[PDB]
Design an enzyme around this catalytic site. Structure first.
Site, short mmCIF file in Angstrom:
data_model
loop_
_atom_site.label_atom_id
_atom_site.label_comp_id
_atom_site.label_asym_id
_atom_site.label_seq_id
_atom_site.Cartn_x
_atom_site.Cartn_y
_atom_site.Cartn_z
N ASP A 10 24.54 78.05 20.91
CA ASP A 10 24.89 76.79 21.63
C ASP A 10 25.20 77.07 23.12
O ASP A 10 24.81 76.23 23.95
CB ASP A 10 26.09 76.06 20.98
CG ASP A 10 25.75 75.11 19.83
OD1 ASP A 10 24.57 75.09 19.38
OD2 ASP A 10 26.69 74.37 19.40
N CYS A 45 12.15 72.46 24.23
CA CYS A 45 13.58 72.61 23.84
C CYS A 45 14.16 71.21 23.97
O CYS A 45 13.43 70.27 23.70
CB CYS A 45 14.24 73.77 24.60
SG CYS A 45 13.90 73.79 26.41
N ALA A 100 15.23 69.81 27.24
CA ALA A 100 14.62 69.32 28.52
C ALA A 100 13.21 69.90 28.72
O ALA A 100 12.45 69.32 29.52
CB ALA A 100 15.51 69.64 29.70
N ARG A 144 14.93 77.34 27.84
CA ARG A 144 14.39 78.20 26.76
C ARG A 144 12.86 78.18 26.78
O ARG A 144 12.22 79.26 26.54
CB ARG A 144 14.92 77.73 25.39
CG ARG A 144 16.44 77.73 25.33
CD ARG A 144 16.96 77.16 24.04
NE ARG A 144 18.38 76.88 24.14
CZ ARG A 144 19.10 76.30 23.17
NH1 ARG A 144 18.50 75.86 22.06
NH2 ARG A 144 20.39 76.07 23.38
N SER A 145 12.27 77.01 27.00
CA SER A 145 10.79 76.85 27.03
C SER A 145 10.20 77.73 28.14
O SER A 145 9.13 78.35 27.91
CB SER A 145 10.42 75.39 27.24
OG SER A 145 10.67 74.56 26.08
N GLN A 199 16.77 77.97 33.74
CA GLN A 199 17.84 77.02 34.19
C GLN A 199 19.09 77.74 34.70
O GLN A 199 19.95 77.04 35.35
CB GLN A 199 18.24 76.08 33.04
CG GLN A 199 17.30 74.90 32.86
CD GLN A 199 17.79 74.02 31.73
OE1 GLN A 199 17.72 74.37 30.55
NE2 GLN A 199 18.33 72.86 32.06
#
Ligand SMILES: Nc1ccccc1N1CCOCC1
Ligand SMILES: Nc1ccccc1N1CCOCC1
Length: 284
Positions: A181, A215, A217, A221-222, A262
């Site tokens: 998380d 993911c 947004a 992670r993407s 990010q």
């Protein structure tokens, strides 16, 4: 400069935040005018995350062709990816329309439907074989065929039917279920194992349309997934694997979608994944 030495130099000097801000400053800025039209407000999860006009995926319909999704085309690596937000309740039909129209074989999901006690994306695939989903707005039917649950990821076989033509296709759903998380994984070993399972499936190969990756947004992670895959492929293809510059590859990918990677922690993790993956497929 061998990225493993660049890595230790940034760690010992604790300059990850400085490196990350330099990328933010140099990144491309292209218009996103279609994303910001009033008719599209309920098609965007986040007001500050939009596809550029030049690279956006168009739906094949005259009514409204808009979806929050971008084509990342990596010319030297010979790989393409579609990066998209987690589907919203009113865009699950659009999502599967895109998969169908773009001839994708695979969907890569890097989030849980609920994280931090909040909904991060719609439940957009069926959870039982005998309870299929019909998307009436786009004329598609989606059936769960099989599910294989592992400790760090789940793979699903899905059947997508175009109800207009009665054509059917097999879609593979690759669901990474253990990203924490907060922050990033302590070791990149399970994320690299997962990337190798997607590769082994055919989902990233040029005989298919581009893989769909999301993911919440579709940038953080993407971003880490496509950046690690592209850097490893370039290290295989080139005469000098040490010439691969992760910061330059990230800026190239940011020409096609804003905000990829990010946080400075996600940047450090992408470096760790590429360094550990290089020495597994090969060594040195
Ligand atoms: N409407 C919706 C909202 C959020 C997630 C999934 C859906 N499904 C669409 C197709 O019929 C089954 C439900
Ligand atoms: N059975 C089938 C027939 C014609 C096209 C595609 C398929 N798929 C194969 C694997 O499971 C998902 C659907």
């Amino acid at each position: 400069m061998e990225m493993e030495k660049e890595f230790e130099q940034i760690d010992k000097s604790g300059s990850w935040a400085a490196i990350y801000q330099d990328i933010r400053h140099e990144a491309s800025d292209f218009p996103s005018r279609v994303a910001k039209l009033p008719k599209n407000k309920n098609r965007n999860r986040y007001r500050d995350v939009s596809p550029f006009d030049h690279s956006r995926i168009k739906l094949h319909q005259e009514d409204n062709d808009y979806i929050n999704a971008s084509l990342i085309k990596m010319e030297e690596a010979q790989r393409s990816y579609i990066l998209t937000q987690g589907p919203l309740p009113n865009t699950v039909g659009h999502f599967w329309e895109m998969v169908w129209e773009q001839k994708s074989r695979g969907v890569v999901m890097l989030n849980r439907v609920m994280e931090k006690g909040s909904l991060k994306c719609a439940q957009y695939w069926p959870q039982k074989e005998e309870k299929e989903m019909i998307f009436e707005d786009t004329n598609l039917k989606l059936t769960l065929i099989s599910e294989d649950i592992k400790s760090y990821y789940t793979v699903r076989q899905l059947e997508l039917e175009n109800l207009t033509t009665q054509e059917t296709r097999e879609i593979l759903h690759f669901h990474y279920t253990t990203w924490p998380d907060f922050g990033v994984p302590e070791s990149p070993a399970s994320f690299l194992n997962f990337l190798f399972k997607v590769r082994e499936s055919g989902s990233l190969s040029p005989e298919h349309g581009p893989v769909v990756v999301h993911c919440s947004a579709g940038i953080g992670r993407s971003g880490t997934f496509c950046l690690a895959d592209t850097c490893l492929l370039l290290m295989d293809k080139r005469k000098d694997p040490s010439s691969v510059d992760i910061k330059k590859v990230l800026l190239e990918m940011r020409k096609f979608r804003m905000g990829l990677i990010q946080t400075a922690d996600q940047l450090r993790f992408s470096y760790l994944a590429v360094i550990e993956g290089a020495k597994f497929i090969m060594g040195d």
